[PDB]
Paper text:
Mpro substrate recognition has unique features and is specific for Gln residue at P1, hydrophobic residues at P2, and small side chains such as Ser and Ala at P1’. The absence of similar sites in human proteases together with the importance of the enzyme for the viral replication makes Mpro a primary target for antiviral discovery and development. Herein, we evaluated the effect of single mutations in the active site of Mpro from circulating polymorphisms on the kinetics and inhibitory constants of nirmatrelvir and ensitrelvir.
The binding modes of nirmatrelvir to both A193S and A193T mutants were similar, but the displacement is more severe in A193S, causing the disruption of pyrrolidone hydrogen bound with E166. The structure of A193T and A193S mutants showed that the increased steric volume and polar features of the side chains caused a displacement of the inhibitor related to the WT. More distant mutations affecting subsites P3-P4 small residues, such as A191T, A191V, A193T, and A193S (but not A193V) have shown significantly increased Ki values for nirmatrelvir when compared with P1 and P2 mutations. Mutants N142S, R188S, A191V, A193S, and A193T showed similar relative catalytic efficiencies to the WT.
Author numbering:
A (entry chain B): 1 to 47, 51 to 305
B (entry chain A): 1 to 302
Amino acid sequence: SGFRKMAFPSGKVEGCMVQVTCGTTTLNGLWLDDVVYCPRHVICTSENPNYEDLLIRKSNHNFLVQAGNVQLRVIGHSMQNCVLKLKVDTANPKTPKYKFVRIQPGQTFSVLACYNGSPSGVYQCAMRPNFTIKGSFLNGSCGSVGFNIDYDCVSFCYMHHMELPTGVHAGTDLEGNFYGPFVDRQTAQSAGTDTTITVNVLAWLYAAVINGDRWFLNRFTTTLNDFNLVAMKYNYEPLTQDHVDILGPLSAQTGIAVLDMCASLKELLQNGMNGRTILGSALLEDEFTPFDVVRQCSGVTF
Amino acid sequence: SGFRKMAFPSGKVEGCMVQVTCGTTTLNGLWLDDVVYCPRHVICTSEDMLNPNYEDLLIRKSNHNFLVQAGNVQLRVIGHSMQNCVLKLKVDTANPKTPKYKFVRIQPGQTFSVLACYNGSPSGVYQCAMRPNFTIKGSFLNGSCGSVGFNIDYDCVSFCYMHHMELPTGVHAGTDLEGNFYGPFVDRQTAQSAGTDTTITVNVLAWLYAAVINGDRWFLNRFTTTLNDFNLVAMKYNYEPLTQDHVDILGPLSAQTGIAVLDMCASLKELLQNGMNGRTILGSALLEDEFTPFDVVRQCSG
Ligand SMILES: *C(=N)[C@H](C[C@@H]1CCNC1=O)NC(=O)[C@@H]1[C@@H]2[C@H](CN1C(=O)[C@@H](NC(=O)C(F)(F)F)C(C)(C)C)C2(C)C
Ligand SMILES: CC(C)(C)[C@H](NC(=O)C(F)(F)F)C(=O)N1C[C@H]2[C@@H]([C@H]1C(=O)N[C@H](C=N)C[C@@H]1CCNC1=O)C2(C)C
């Protein structure tokens, strides 16, 4: 039994973390084959940066690349969107099987927080609908990566770039394309209003049922339209026919039809939790996907 | 910024996890140097589960009755010894991935990371605390047994928990790596139960100090309290009594925020008398007791 906020084992990714230094700026790089990936704002001096020019003007020896106590020699450099690629003289002997993926809002991943190329902590995250993440990042955390594991293949999906005024976090996929309407300048930027990831709440209520927690279940059923009208009143994501099909395995497993569980969720939105908890939370949790619930409640290895 | 339940990177422990088989029972082992440590109930059949005589079953085992497997490689068992409730298996090869490690027995309130493993392959990593009643609120299915709890201090791994059994209230019990149970439990399928759990008061106060540091002050008041008056009230809410020792430990957080420990205790007191009233601290509508004073300083300062 049990239900925990659970990260992927971070071992495969720890074998890839390095330290990148430019003048006085130090942050983290992802060392895969003979290339080190890191945010391009590493090159930046104190003084609206012109990255293209700052990059082309700069020699190879200006990039100090440190893998533990070993120096890596940079033998090339190129830009891809908002990520800098440093061509190194050594293929990473610890390189796992990996692909770069870009994730949709509501999709979850593990962040490996690092400082000075040194992995510090791992935590589970969700891509918010406003494309921010509620992470935990201090100074030097930039270049820290988000990832999933599928068997032995690490799918890297996130590189950390910045903290927003609301204490929430912004970054790019490993191809340097920002998630959300952001720019890597010190310019004034702000998270749009977040919404609750409805399908995830429903998956987590299924996790509640599976662990013997049933007080919120009722005998009513609703329709998508009625549910979706109530949802957008509480800043909940619309529920699609897609979502309903993806929760099917959980509906089948528990014997509770999705459109019933939507009625249960509706009552909770309108009525609150009545001084009760669900899986030990006073808040409806939306950072577990349907897959996450199936993975944890079936067990799955790598 | 941000405040996340945060586990240690699992790489150094992933390198040590093995699968141990005896008869039809397979669970997980911890492979350190030329010893595999695992729960001794791996040698129990179905019948044995109620009043196992461990000495009488192990005296009936040869080395070759224990299958130890590391990935594809089957390890060769060359000696078997019992220490309390862990079995120690001497093996041909010393684990080359052996990190700096020590074995540590922790006290209730102390936190660690759990690497949930099945068939010697890791499933996920989460962060736990030893509950006052010597149980943990884990996430463990069939065959999770021998999964370990650890902390990492620089590059030294300290092993503090090995997983043995699930109690009827869906909470978990285990031993230190010397095989002495945390709490009054025994590795038998006889009727046993956890004492009533209490809230880890020192940890909730730590979490409140973090809240101020991350800029949230909605909950403070202008009162102070005596240590005795605090405990007289706090026990009435099933809180762990606060000791002078605990007050000493909070000194640094008290210094950094400028809020006296007994002033913070007045705040906590009022929160219990009222509750949240729809408001939250650090994204929670409950009081968090699974961050220690050390955890908070590490994640918010440096
Ligand atoms: C190890 N592979 C399992 C794992 C359990 C069940 C799912 N999550 C877990 O932590 N553990 C066991 O097989 C141990 C083992 C005998 C019985 N047992 C139990 O987990 C049982 N609990 C108790 O012994 C009891 F009653 F005291 F709570 C069970 C009732 C099956 C849950 C031994 C030797 C303790
Ligand atoms: C909040 C701050 C003023 C620091 C700024 N944010 C904004 O620019 C905004 F406020 F305008 F949004 C910001 O983070 N950066 C400024 C500069 C890079 C980025 C940066 O160096 N990031 C930190 C790096 N190791 C990570 C931080 C530390 C604490 N928690 C984090 O995550 C770039 C946007 C090019």
